[PDB]
Write a protein that binds this DNA or RNA. Sequence first.
RNA 1: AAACUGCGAAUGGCUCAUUAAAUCAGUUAUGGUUCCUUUGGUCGCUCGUACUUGGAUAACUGUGGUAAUUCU
RNA 2: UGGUGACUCUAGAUAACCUCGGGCCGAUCGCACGCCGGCGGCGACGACCCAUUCGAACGUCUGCCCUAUCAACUUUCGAUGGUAGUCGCCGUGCCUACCAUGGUGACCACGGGUGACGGGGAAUCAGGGUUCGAUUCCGGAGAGGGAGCCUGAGAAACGGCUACCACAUCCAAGGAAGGCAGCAGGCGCGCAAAUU
RNA 3: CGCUACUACCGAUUGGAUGGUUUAGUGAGGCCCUCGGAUCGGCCCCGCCGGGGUGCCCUGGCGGAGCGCUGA
Lengths: 262, 151, 50, 205
Amino acid sequence: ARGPKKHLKRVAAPKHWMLDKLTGVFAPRPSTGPHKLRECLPLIIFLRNRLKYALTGDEVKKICMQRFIKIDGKVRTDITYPAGFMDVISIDKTGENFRLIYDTKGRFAVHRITPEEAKYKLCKVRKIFVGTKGIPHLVTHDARTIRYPDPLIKVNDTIQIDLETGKITDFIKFDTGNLCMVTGGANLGRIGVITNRERHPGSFDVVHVKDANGNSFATRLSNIFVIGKGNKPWISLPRGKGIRLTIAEERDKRLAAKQSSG
Amino acid sequence: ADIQTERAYQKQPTIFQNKKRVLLGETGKEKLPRYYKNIGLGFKTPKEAIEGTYIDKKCPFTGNVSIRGRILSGVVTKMKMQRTIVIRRDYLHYIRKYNRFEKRHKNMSVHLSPCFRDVQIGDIVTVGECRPLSKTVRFNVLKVTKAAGTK
Amino acid sequence: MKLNISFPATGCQKLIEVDDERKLRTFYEKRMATEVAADALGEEWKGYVV
Amino acid sequence: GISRDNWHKRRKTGGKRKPYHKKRKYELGRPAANTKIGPRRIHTVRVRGGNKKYRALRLDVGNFSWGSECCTRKTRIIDVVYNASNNELVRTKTLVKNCIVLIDSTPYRQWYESHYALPLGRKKGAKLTPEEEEILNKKRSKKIQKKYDERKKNAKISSLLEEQFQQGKLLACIASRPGQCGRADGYVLEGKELEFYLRKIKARK
RNA sequence: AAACUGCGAAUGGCUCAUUAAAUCAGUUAUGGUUCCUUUGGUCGCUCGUACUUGGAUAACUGUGGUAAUUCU
RNA sequence: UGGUGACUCUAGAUAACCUCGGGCCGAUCGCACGCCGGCGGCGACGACCCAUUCGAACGUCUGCCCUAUCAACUUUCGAUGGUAGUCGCCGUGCCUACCAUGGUGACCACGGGUGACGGGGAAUCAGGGUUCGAUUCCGGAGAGGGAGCCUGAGAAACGGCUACCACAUCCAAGGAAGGCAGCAGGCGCGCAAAUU
RNA sequence: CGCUACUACCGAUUGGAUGGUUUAGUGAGGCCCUCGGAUCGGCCCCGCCGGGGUGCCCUGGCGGAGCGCUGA
């Protein structure tokens, strides 16, 4: 193909969007933005498929062009805007705020947060570099650049950005005993305490994470996102607290819920 | 030995060898610093690389090549080019219908720096992947282990 | 050969039909943007240069 | 057009590789910038990504550096005397990277004499004209003459560079690619490199 | 409206002729490159008519040529 | 200063250079607005550069059908490597000059065939397997056949251009115009496939 | 060894056709380079009360009938 592609097929779209195989040939190709194509959630998917606020893409367009949706405190009118991990979606007309946080099944949840929690977010620092008269710069997972970071912040750490100002307020080091989410791979959406890190020079480091329920798993270092200091998260967790139940336990819980409900 | 066997001057590009000399600047010795680097992954710089005089811009230790990617091993089978050898990687390929294996091999033209003297046919070489160095060379000899029979 | 003659000082123009080659052996073999006296077209054209 | 692909090349086994697609634009090549010596003529080339390459076609001036003295000056390029790649490049006098050239030593000698009190060269052994003794001797104070004398002791030049300065031209190596960046920059040959290239130039005659 | 300007027209759609380590799949690399756009940062950091500079050219008016064109 | 397993990285210092076809450092636009005149909100647009967002490109490792009634191939005019360069967005025999005589092969090289685009996958199948995959997803290629380009971030683009080869349209013979392997539709081909 | 029919070979001679590959000669058309300079401007300059030398007299657009320089 010559030049960039501009379409995304319905069946070739990311699976975690949970799209049909009969409601059209195309899936909304997310715009270029702070998050990768396969790791984002387009605004049209969130407003139409998730929140049911629209029944068509035209209604999503109307909602977005009335300037009602803020992403990280800034109004976005792009219906294919790539919203991703740790982002904040504010709808002041209905007075709600959501955070984009993975379920244990690896899918972005509809996780409502308080209006005072929507004033900040967490960003994993992807790199730190000194430029142009020795000014340190930091690049996070939102592709946002922060000048003059704390000289203690290193790669793989987490920083709490104030959305109003864009400045760093606090940070969590990447160390054992710290809480972390998994943002990719088979264990995507799981939360647990870092127990170990195997360094593999010239290759991918492997980080071992222990669940709150004693379960253990491993991921690549790029798939780890430090959520809180110690075992206390700095953000509100979804319904499941990052505990991946086996299929049997999920079936048992569903049967208990059926018994209690009908 | 004369390291100037080419139509152009051979030098390490990062070493300034004609800094000004005066009575205080020369006391019985001219001095010539040697550029060498420690490649990663635990490979140690051979002594001849540090204290040698050869000029090789494809040498992993004193040249301009970055070792990144696959780190493979092979057996030296031909040493008949200049600063390049042919090694042979022997493996077994699994045929599933018969549940059996078949011997296969692949030749690899790899760059050998002048820092590895006394390399023989049958020697085992650990090579590291680098950028394309010629039409066929993509690996640089990082380590040499002599074949069993050293006495 | 017709002549599309334009006076720019008043922005006017007119298509003259000249069929007498005697009236035309003053533009021939001359390239574009070459200033030629128009006296060979008629008595009224005396003094004109185009 | 001019193609830099590999599928026209034979396989490393000697096998012949058939073409599976027609030439692509990103595989192109361009005619060489045979940078001759002459009045400055540079053509700008639009390259992939929209960037510009400066295809220099004629040059007579370059930013050459005297490394030992750390003296970089803009200097006229007189000649090209040695080329390690092809001898025909000297015959046609083509500026390329790593070609040995004769440049004009005047700015280097001016800085050389402004950092005064070296051994005598052409300062008083080849030319005795006025209008330059007020930059060689002047009327200096105690501090200024003391500083110049402190320069004097560590102020010497290799005999090869000395006769080059005497002859008015210096041997230099072009360290930039004039056909890409449009500049014939480089450095003055010194040390063992100068001896090497002098011997190579001698062996060509 | 027209026209100048900006952007897209390199996506999509069709087909399987070529193509036998080629393509392709898994894996890995670019510390060997380019990258419109989006997003974030940078954007008085330069010691040397400005309370806004110049020439055109379309659209339009008018005269036309060719049997003929989205010619001019 | 900071970073990597590893820089000839990043940042810093110095001496100079800085492309006629010449690099950025805003002579642009809307809405709401109030003093002797000053100040100023929120935008739109635009421009270097740094950030791999979408990519693309080029490499590593392993894997592909039949054939020996194909056993030696490459090396002239690059074949394998070395040195310097040219070109290129960059690594590179990519292309030159010089040098060395290399490189592949019975573990099947080289050549020939394929009614061969590759894969996800399909049919059948006790366990093994056999056959298929033009075909809606991913990747590649092409737009009658070749070739060469312009513009552009991105094309060697064909619902772009230029030429040649084949075919072919209109003409007042001077000239002009073309490309359905897009959707329909027609002819032809056929055992074989739909609505202008 | 005679009848009859279809394949296949060597094919007497090469009338046969969308054919490919090639030494040598020629070679359209782009691209690049070295030239060329139709033409179009801008400065200096003979100029005209719609022109700072103020007993108004003369920058800037021109009305300012050289090609000398210079740019495209």
